[PDB]
Symmetry: C4
Subunit: 332 residues, 4 copies
């Protein structure tokens, strides 16, 4: 595999069509899904030349851990849909690559099993039925050694996925929510923040005022994100709001971005627009579907090579230098 | 049906080609027809998160009536072209859905029959031959219980519909103007305003100065509209003028928009740009053609679900909140 | 025929391919030829409503003559390439329609014969070999009753037409320059201006400073024009420079535009951007090829209908009102 | 051949596919390769009219030599891949055309042999293993009569060429680096500048601050360039940074540009944006592949004709006049 696109072809071969569609699809007309890619393709980097590259490093420090790349595996529910080893295959490859893995509330293997793989994981939270029950999931995650709570804040309910409706898609009986919902509010965020000393990361922020309020609320990070085009159809891509958000929070929390990251060059673009790190969702699942744990290992090795290549060609010996690169919008 | 586009396919199947073309077509090269869709597709919404959604409501108050959605059925002439029950099927479904229905001057069932369906309808006026005759239509509508006069102001004469010319299209002998024209001016508006206490809504405004003059003229609303691309070919889409118009009228009248609204997400975009409500034309006729009254019921149920979904995913418990959303223009 | 595009199809049927290419083609990669259309398609008009349309007139006064439309037939060399009656067929139809016809220096019928058709024609000048010889052509035109000299200023030599090179195109032996070249300069303009009291119109101006200098030089008009994409490939379309030029000349001369005008709506766009009138080139030749004089008559009747339709739908009772319309750039 | 595109078709016919791909390809998704063309196609020139064209000249003075055109042959490694005479065929044609030829560090004929062809060549430097060894290459070039050192500064290592990876491409055993690498820094530039009195030209500058620093470093020129889309994928095209760079250096060094120049009109656009001259890479190799030395001669004759045509149609008797032309960005 020499690009992330090789793995999508491989995953489309192997998966049942309705599972490929569950993975690939967005809500509505998929305008926001498409716009995530169009928005990244319009961004051009202005590289710097002739800088010292003797010790290029792609490492970052985030939420009190060193990560090998400015990247984490996005939360993706029900990974046994894609491969029998599901979350354990992905988490093992992420650990070995030095990349944080986000354990999902809707994981198809229990969060304690996935956390036992090691690799200092994160835990993604959907607000439940109940404050008390939500907080038990948080405490479970913390007790199991998760290092951050990624609170998803853009899913008061799930978006309308027309592919899934047209397919009549439902979980196979062999895929269950192994850890076993009400709309979250800022009060829910405060309840979580009071319940844990782990950093709380709010995933699904797009409005500048919501990024500022996240800082004021004591979030340790946000993920600027339209949920891969799966929630509001017509929501702006995160990458289009990232620069304005980074300026507004003025270093008050980590600012991650996701949606359409498909190469180390895209990682570089996100960094140059100010992101602390990116999440990568669908490509990780393509690699899982294509070749299990080894597939995800090859994907993360390929991304690491592409990030290092892009950084050095742009004159950046560190991710901090990459955040100081300038960009130019072009027409595609 | 899971999208408005499913119904267009169904209507294209059933209608004679020349009737489908009468419905689908625009004037000239159909530049303005296409631009209505392109303009909406360029608009992205910036959703808000973590707001209270305990009692999301899509209702609005407009022209002294509560409506179930920020939407009305646009005036579309000669609806017996599309289904034998014509206007009565549409008006019955609109009533049952709580959505205003606009009775046309060129309806193929008399306005008194359609008004007897109930549902507090509106009446669309074309200026006639004569001030005295125009005012009789207005008084008829008011006597029959119509609640607003939608005065069409963009049709001094009808635009040049090349599909209809190429088809040699004419009304079947079984379709007639059951209520039975000179260019309207601001004097005509004043004559109507003096003749009725119903709110007068000027449909087909695109220039900012004309929206201000409509307020000064005592209009209770305007519809920002290029008539579905059927009048001047090369007229700007209403959605491109809406924000400037809303700012100029500064709450002095209701500001509706139409042209290309094809989902609850599009309704949300129009609201976020400042519209009080939208009109929907061709999709209602697709549903009528596809399945009569039941077809229109299913369309309005689908739109209601999509509007509620879009509002809540954008953090809006009310249409007023949706009007306070910000938008971003993207490239598509 | 219900659009200018119907006539292009008809002309492509009848003409030899290499003659169709001589007519249709541009220089280089035809970037400027294509851009003339793209530039017009991006322009949207903001129509006004509810104005008095009791006496809509498309007439203008230009160069001391009333014209029926804000339009003239562009200079197109060698019209016997397209039909045996050549220039005489076109000039007769233009006369009957009340539209100025531009007699070409390279006409395939002598300028005195074409002028004898009547209709108060204009004469297009290419600068010759010699000041004395150029001025004799001017005097010939004036003696024959031409009413303006259209001095082409964008052809120091002819552009590189790759279609013609690939075809090995040359004039049939039955087509000759019946009136029988050095680069023109501002000194040439002054020599012409001193030799005639007819208005001198400089055709092929694109730079704002050249439009101002044309006024200072005593031009009575300019044509803002990239010569139909046939001269510099990569020259900006005239329609993209028109508004800036109209503002710069501040009424000091007539400002015409050409390039890609293909409907009455396009005429309206050019007027709304400030043009006094347009020229139309290739469509006139399509109609000539398709059906001789009668073909050109039908084209001019169709354009007249489309101009009147567009003006009235935009609320303009006169071309002056149309010049006061505002426009909005859109994306197509 | 009437356009550069004719030669690409001819080269694609004759070359082995994997050699055509080595030549044609870029890094990554080839976004920057494509953007070089898209960026040029968006630029329109505003031509001037009626200027004296009695002695149009395309000559420039650069690095102390008169050149016949504002153009040089770009450095392209391993030209025996494309034709058996390789660099000698190209250098002979360049000499005969009066166009500088850039001898590559990775030439497949030794730099002394190519320099013996004559024509006052330039020498392109890749920084080596060692300061001492790099400086020996520079001194070799100077001793052989090269007139400028083109130091490539955008290749700390080579970009990831996916076509070459997919093809498993490697040099034929009959193609070698006949002159026989560490990342260059500003210290390397200073070492070169101190070692030679020849002008040092830094090739691969895109950031404005790097262009200013190049002047401060004593560069005699820069080439604003993303290396033909072969280095960082997502690097901005040089033509998009050229105007800002020309303004920033304020005449302190020559500013060349490359990437996608495919006609004399493109040369004119680059000049109008402020370039001193352009480099042309792939088209020269197409002509070499198609027809050896004679092929390159025909290409350079065609470019010379197109540059002279474009200049005169734009009213420029000299390249200096062309740099004073204004441009307008359009949509394509
Ligand atoms: C199949 C699928 C399942 C997902 N499940 C969740 C989830 O349970 N929680 C969540 O916060 N995000 C979920 N996401 C969104 C991802 O975390 C991420 O925001 C989106 O996929 C990132 O975009 P990318 O896939 O383009 O890289 C899911 C995404 C996909 C494709
Ligand atoms: C077939 C047809 C007939 C129409 N008849 C009228 C009419 O009689 N009066 C009027 O004001 N608008 C008329 N309209 C315009 C609609 O009210 C509305 O402005 C346009 O259709 C809205 O756009 P949409 O169809 O894209 O939703 C008609 C539209 C169509 C398609
Ligand atoms: C076949 C052909 C011949 C032309 N000959 C002349 C000419 O002799 N003199 C001149 O000023 N313009 C000439 N023109 C340019 C037209 O006057 C006009 O600028 C261009 O065609 C207008 O664009 P349109 O064809 O898109 O309407 C010619 C155009 C064509 C297509
Ligand atoms: C096959 C190939 C080999 C190249 N080798 C070199 C090289 O050794 N050194 C260098 O500075 N540029 C090299 N270049 C880049 C060119 O000098 C130039 O920047 C790029 O090709 C210019 O773009 P164009 O090919 O679109 O005209 C190479 C380009 C190609 C296509």
């Amino acid at each position: 595999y020499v690009s992330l696109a090789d793995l999508e072809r491989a995953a489309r071969d192997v998966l049942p069509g309705e599972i490929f569609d569950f993975l690939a699809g967005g809500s509505g007309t998929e305008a926001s899904l498409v716009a995530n890619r169009t928005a990244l393709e319009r961004v051009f980097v202005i590289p710097r030349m002739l800088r010292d590259l003797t010790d290029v490093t792609t490492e970052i420090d985030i939420f009190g851990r060193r990560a090998a790349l400015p990247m984490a595996v996005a939360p993706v529910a029900y990974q046994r849909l894609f491969h029998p080893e599901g979350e354990l295959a992905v988490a093992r490859a992420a650990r070995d690559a030095g990349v944080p893995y986000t354990i999902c509330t809707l994981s198809s293997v229990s969060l304690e099993e996935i956390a036992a793989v090691g690799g200092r994981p994160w835990f993604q939270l959907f607000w439940l039925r109940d404050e008390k029950r939500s907080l038990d999931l948080v405490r479970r995650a913390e007790d199991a050694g998760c290092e951050a709570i990624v609170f998803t804040v853009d899913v008061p309910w799930m978006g309308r996925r027309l592919r899934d409706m047209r397919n009549g898609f439902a979980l196979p009986e062999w895929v269950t929510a192994a850890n076993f919902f009400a709309p979250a509010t800022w009060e829910s965020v405060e309840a979580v923040r009071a319940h844990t000393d782990l950093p709380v990361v709010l995933k699904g922020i797009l409005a500048v005022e919501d990024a500022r309020r996240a800082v004021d609320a004591g979030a340790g990070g946000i993920v600027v994100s339209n949920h891969g085009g799966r929630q509001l159809d017509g929501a702006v891509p995160g990458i289009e709001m990232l620069g304005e958000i980074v300026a507004a929070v003025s270093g008050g929390c980590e600012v991650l971005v996701d949606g359409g990251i498909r190469s180390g060059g895209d990682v570089l673009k996100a960094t140059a627009l100010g992101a602390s790190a990116v999440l990568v969702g669908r490509p990780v699942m393509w690699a899982l579907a294509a070749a299990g744990q080894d597939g995800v290992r090859q994907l993360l090795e390929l991304l690491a090579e592409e990030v290092r290549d892009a950084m050095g060609l742009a004159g950046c010996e560190s991710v901090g230098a990459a955040r100081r690169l300038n960009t130019k919008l072009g027409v595609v």
